[PDB]
């Protein structure tokens, strides 16, 4: 009851904890980056089929 209740962390521990937390946050960013890049990759993969040219609009209207 006389002693301090908790041992406050030394600044070395503070720096190390900062490193761990920033690693977690940056890893989440890294996962999200992979996911967006993969989605873009699949979009570009299948973007052949999409129709942005009227000259190709007539082509596909005739085909279908």
């Amino acid at each position: 009851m006389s002693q301090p209740l908790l041992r406050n962390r030394s600044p070395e521990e503070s720096e190390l904890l900062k490193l761990k937390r920033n690693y977690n946050r940056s890893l989440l960013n890294f996962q999200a980056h992979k996911k967006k890049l993969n989605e873009l990759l699949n979009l570009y993969h299948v973007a052949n089929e999409f129709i942005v040219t009227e000259s190709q609009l007539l082509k596909k209207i005739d085909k279908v």
Partner: protein, 131 residues
Amino acid sequence: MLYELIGLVRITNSNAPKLEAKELSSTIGKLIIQNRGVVRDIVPMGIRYLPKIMKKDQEKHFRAYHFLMLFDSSAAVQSEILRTLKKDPRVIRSSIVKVDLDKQLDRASSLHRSLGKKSILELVNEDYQSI
């Protein structure tokens, strides 16, 4: 933004029913593309009898050509597309439903999805390039 349009076109020429569908599809695709849009797909549903004798303007229809057009486009431009469809004599009915692209960017049509093709990648089977 993805929008699936399902249009019901009138058959007035009995020998070549599909022509009005072709002309409407061409017009709407021209609108979409010329307004910085994309028309991802056109699914040609067949000719079918209507559930009732449904009436637009004065003419009364019993059978029609149904088609589905999936397109990525902006809000004002789909609004204008709908306005053109409703005032066009050829289109008995139209229905433009959003498809949420929140989780995946590339998505198939409602019918192809109902078969089980949640994205057009499975429709056109494989791409075959990695990393």
